[PDB]
Copies of this chain bind each other. A is one copy, B any other.
Amino acid sequence: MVILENSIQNKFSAGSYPLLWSYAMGVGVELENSMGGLNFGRSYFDPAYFRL
């Protein structure tokens, strides 16, 4: 849906769940040596949750 640029890849965007996204950003940095290379920088990032 994001290769095709579908209209409802805005709906799976992390802005509708920005706290639970940041939490799962916080979990996945330690549990992957790969996800350390993931860029995740958005205007809704909420780093308080990320360190929780």
Interface residues on A, range: under 10
Q: Which of B19, B31, B33, B34 contacts A31 (CB 8 A)?
A: B19
Contacts of A32 in B (CB 8 A): 18
CB distance from A31 to the nearest CB of B (A): 7
Main secondary structure of the interface of A (DSSP, over half): loop
A47 to B43, CA, bound (A): 29
Contacts of A33 in B (CB 8 A): 44, 46
Contacts of A19 in B (CB 8 A): 31
- By beta carbon, the residue of chain B nearest A34 is B44
Which A residues are closer than 8 A to B by beta carbons? 18-19, 31-34, 43-44, 46
